[PDB]
């Protein structure tokens, strides 16, 4: 049985262990580290994907495109805080207009 | 030969949302952010281990790296889920 199944994780916990061992990050890796990392990555992916899908459905689209993905990421303040230094190719920009620029008098 | 996370990304997405699709551009972006976060956590754990003079990264090393990197509320739920996964795996023995 796959270790992923025993843990109940979608991501390949075994491949994660392989990468951590080969990646020379540390001399030794406790068996709890790959499962913990795998669960964390899976969780983060779950939220980002959920947001992307919600954005796509907002457009009435069904395939997530970098426009939708960018909207999703920036809509969430804390994901923005994590990806604050990340640029998305074809991401575009958020709609931002200053109230002082609006035409006519108040 | 190469390897990518695209398959698992598709799987989890379908589990969240069977009707929604992904283009290669979005798929590669997802792969890239997963890779970046993985590198970030691994380097933080390596640092924390070396700082405490421990040679073996552990559930504690990853726990504390996730505490540091993730925003506090996102960190709290990430650690909760990770703990649940770890305990269920260990109980699988």
């Amino acid at each position: 049985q796959s270790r992923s199944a025993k843990a109940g994780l979608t991501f390949p916990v075994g491949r994660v262990h392989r990468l951590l061992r080969r990646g020379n990050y540390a001399q030794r890796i406790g068996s709890g580290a790959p499962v913990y990392l795998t669960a964390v990555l899976e969780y983060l992916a779950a939220e980002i994907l959920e947001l992307a899908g919600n954005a796509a459905r907002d457009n009435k689209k069904t395939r997530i495109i970098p426009r939708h993905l960018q909207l999703a990421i920036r809509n969430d303040d804390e994901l923005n805080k994590l990806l604050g230094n990340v640029t998305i190719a074809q991401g575009g920009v958020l709609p931002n207009i200053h109230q002082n620029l609006l035409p006519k008098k108040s | 030969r190469k390897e990518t996370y695209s398959s698992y990304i598709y799987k989890v997405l379908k589990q969240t949302h069977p009707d929604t699709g992904i283009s290669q551009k979005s798929m590669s972006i997802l792969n890239s952010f997963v890779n970046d976060i993985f590198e970030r956590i691994a380097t933080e754990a390596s640092k924390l281990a070396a700082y405490n003079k421990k040679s073996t990264i552990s559930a504690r090393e990853i726990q504390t790296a996730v505490r540091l990197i993730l925003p506090g509320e996102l960190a709290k739920h990430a650690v909760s889920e990770g703990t649940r996964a770890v305990t269920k795996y260990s109980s699988s023995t």
């Binding site: 779950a46 939220e47 959920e50 | 589990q15 949302h17 009707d19 739920h77």
Partner: peptide, 19 residues
């Protein structure tokens, strides 16, 4: 499909107040 299918329980939900 439709909003009702999006609401249907047959999916991995997330529980964050923002989502």
């Amino acid at each position: 499909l439709n909003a009702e299918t999006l609401l249907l329980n047959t999916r991995r939900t997330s529980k964050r107040s923002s989502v």
